[model samples]
Target: STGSATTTPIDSLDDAYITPVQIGTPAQTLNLDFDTGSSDLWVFSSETTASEVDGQTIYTPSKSTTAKLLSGATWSISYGDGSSSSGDVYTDTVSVGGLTVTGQAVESAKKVSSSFTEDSTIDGLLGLAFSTLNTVSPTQQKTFFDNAKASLDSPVFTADLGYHAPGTYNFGFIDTTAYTGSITYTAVSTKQGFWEWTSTGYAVGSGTFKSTSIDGIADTGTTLLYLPATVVSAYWAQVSGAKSSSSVGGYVFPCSATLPSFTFGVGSARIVIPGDYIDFGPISTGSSSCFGGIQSSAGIGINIFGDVALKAAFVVFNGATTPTLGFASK
Candidate 1:
């Protein structure tokens, strides 16, 4: 109850990170995407039509003696990236790393979007956001982390995200060896169920830090950094060949363009994103056109500090009384 568990994240298609999780009494292991943006632990299941399942692994509730149907309850979720899943619910033993939670609500998917069905690597999603954001109907369900927090020595989890490399998600304890320098603390506003924070300002490359405040959420499920249109426009302007393209979506620049670093203000500390990371590979496979990792956060309201921005720092999602966030250079 007082110890921490560390889970290694598998870099998936260079888009998201997935972790191993065990569900039910006999331990049915599944590689699940750990998402901070949405709250729902749903998996591709036996209920899903065979044609709709594609290459993903299905969770069979019938195999577990401890699995119990949550009678009339149901759950559904849709991501900003157009992935979605919906189904009925079950209460069972769920384990992540060394921690285990009994009677954790596990949504069994009857249907999934094309994006999810085609994702052969990830079997489901493990929501790390607040339990209030859970999408279960009749009664909202608590996430695995939420249910396990009471028994943890410290109600905290740390995300050490990396670029195309393996990373670790640490629960209950922080590994000082994983990061350098001092960790900066920021007050978090979880009214939206996310690890939300205010960025004092930002700067493009070597430019001075702009004083405009921006509200943003740290989302591990998201792949790119999204900011205000004005900020996106200003940053793209610095790149000689960068331009907004309707066909490609967002801003596109020459793959060879000398990109500038992006700096986001967190209190007095600045989290700097390097130039190389800004060029988010190619817009399309076998094409020289590359898209900017930082794009417009237009319909989403607040900015999104996605994997591109998060991989540069070690993030601590503190779930204690105040729900503060700690960031340290990796």
Candidate 2:
């Protein structure tokens, strides 16, 4: 049977989506961030120091009869935002939506960086990226999707991220009702363990779509869209009060400024982000300044089509030969 699950936004700003996953015997449910950008299934656990626990839920393997420790096995990971988590490994029964995978590698975090410790509500991360990116040392680990694919009717999954709303993540089969129009499939290059693809071009607001090609990754874990410095400058220039703020970092603009929509091309499919979405959020409470959701990917190397971009479309992560990405408007 195909597995279907609901994904809830972490907050109204659409920072991330958390899905409920069941692990171990008798089932310990955890709210995990479904990240397509990383390839490690890790969670806050009993092994973590109390000082690091904060308000997060801990996965206690000792209480699960089906949990088995993988001797000498360990994992460590860091995100683009400098947040990190690391710990020992355990093989257990892991289930998502309705699909189950026996002996799935579950990395239980023993140490977490300040960034993770501060976000106490996020129990852990369920990486849906390529299994080759798993951080388990000595022997790499397979993600839940990887371990369960053979048993599935089809090796495919779809992401339907919403704007300040609940979305759905379907496994093994596609739910055509989640999106509109035809899906435009694009070839993906997984040399970097990400859903990387080349966009035909893009446009700022209602301007003509340029032919300047761009290489980017579909990253669900990231919060904003990141492009080259030149492209960023072009878009922000259209806004009257837009400026690169060293104090706030990236680009900031007057909250009342009227912004234009941004569009990215995937073959014939054009995913467009509304102008309002560009205003990420206010710089601070009672402040007239707001941070732009689009930023420069200069230091990051590759452009990132993050939540701001993904929420505007329905995404398909095809795991078949030569993995492909399919996009459609919502």
Candidate 3:
């Protein structure tokens, strides 16, 4: 909306990702992009060249009455989206809202965006999701969540990632009351941090998982879920000749009929993906396509749980010890 990603001033001067959380008291003001695709806490630094750091909010530890950076370590992170940056690491008493996670790990970005050199407003990003992939070096590889795990209310933190414009991205103790029924839990495979679950099979409503099972993975970084063409086509067939048209960078189906609910077999647990999660947004100008919830990404990356799934549950990204993913009711 600002016409620039790195150079534009953040929407507001008084706003922040949320309130700051310090050990004793909160003092510093920072802006951050709460990213779930990766893990790491980074902020702009004073040491950076004015040009490279322009348009970025650089945090001066000395300026803050509270907060300090940990020494003895340098920080570096490379994102799957093809962005990379590095800086020195520091330990600080950080706070978010009323919750205080002391001795939080933060990276000071000394080298920043080429766009940041144009104007200075964007501060940095906070990796709020799981800990599988974080900017941890071999010597001291741990995410902010991992460092704060001991003090977390229940050793768990979740984001109420609302897609509502001016969305409410709440962080704190996961409030179990936010959900309607029992929140299903699926077993994670020990191999990688992916939320790997074996599916019985893809079935249009009224059917259960069969031998022709499908596997499901939940991801916060992705915006939508991808299914195999056969499975997606088979599932869509139940939507009353739901014809596929191209839109939103891929094939989308018109929302003319009621779509069926499909479940993923995560061992004994069933994770239900609602039809509205796929219907999405509204119809475009004079177009029948309703911007479908599912899109094709085959041969690219497997299924991703996108915001549709995330909005339905509370997610915890535990990246400290061995770095695993966790989810529960919120």
Candidate 4:
């Protein structure tokens, strides 16, 4: 999806809306963000207090006749931003985007932060990415991939993003358009969704990377691709009129510019990020403009190609074939 769906925020019913999902044996209801950033499937329970969590959605398995919670399993998830949630584990049937899967692992969150403790139209998140990054160890729980693989034709799922209107995150097949088909796949490291990739280098219009790539992860759960300062600088260097603002902490190009396209290697295959995204506008932070993508992650794991990078194409995570990922575009 180019832009996000008007999510039901934590504090206001302003644009409050929820995407539905059915989970477990009893068919419990769940509201999910369907995040591409992280691969952890978690839900909040009725046990949560309005004061503890807001803005985020919560799920009540007790409402679902088909839901079942696991006994003795405690769950905790921490994000790169220092945000986290904790809860227990449950088993349930889950359905979304017209697709249904049974025996799915749902994290039962009882304690979530104020960031999650707002408007409260949401209950949890459905991580539609790969199975590799599942917070639940294979020995412990069955992730969305583990549950859905048995039902899909290819045992593979694809994210088909349409317009900014919360594009379809399709399952089982690749969504291909004329030129987007040639894009390639990058092999997943032992870590799965945390992809190890690199951009040899970049140029504005049709610049070339020498074939040097880095260990990159394509995370949909995140909003932007956290690129290293060097990689970020090289990209903006090619944009003849691009401007970098320290206050904004990133580079920004005119929203109207015809961004040149550049490619980075995804394992043996090559994938491209159009300039429009590179030069896209970021809301004014303090004094500088933060472009749509490209943020500086000086101390963290360097950079991650998050949702901003994912929207340009179709991404498929394959758990049935091998522990690897596939990408195609429309």
**Which candidate gets the maximum TM-score versus the true structure?**
2
What C-alpha lDDT does candidate 1 achieve relative to the native structure? 0.86
Candidate 4 regions off by >4 Å?
A: 1-19, 24-29, 118-122, 128-139, 175-179, 192-201, 238-262, 267-270, 279-292
**Number of backbone clashes in candidate 2:** 0
TM-score of each candidate structure, all chains considered together: 0.95, 0.98, 0.66, 0.77
What is the C-alpha lDDT profile of model 3 across 1-330, one tens digit per residue?
000011111333211122232322335666565555556777777776665765555677766554554646776776543466788876676555544455666777877656435534446776755556666564454555556566554454454444332333333344556555454444555354454544455555677555465555655545566666777676667776465665355555665656677654444445566676566544566666655556554754556655655644555443334444444433
Pairs that clash in candidate 1: none
lDDT of 1 by residue, 1-330 (tens): 533434344433357787888898688998888888888999989999787787777789999999999999999888888777899999999887777889999999998888887778889999989888999999999998898899887899888887667788888888899999888989899898998998889999999889888899999888889999999999999999889998988899998898999998888888898887677778888888888899999987779999888888999999998898898888
Clashes of 1: 0
Q: Candidate 2 residues 239-264, lDDT tens each? A: 99899998898999998899999999
CA shift at 297, candidate 2, in angstroms?
Answer: 0.2
Each prediction's RMSD to truth:
1.7, 1.0, 7.3, 5.2
Q: Rank the candidates by lDDT, best first.
A: 2, 1, 4, 3
- lDDT of predicted model 4: 0.60
Q: Which ten residues in a row have the lowest lDDT in candidate 4?
A: 8-17
- Over 4 Å off in model 1, which ranges? 2-13
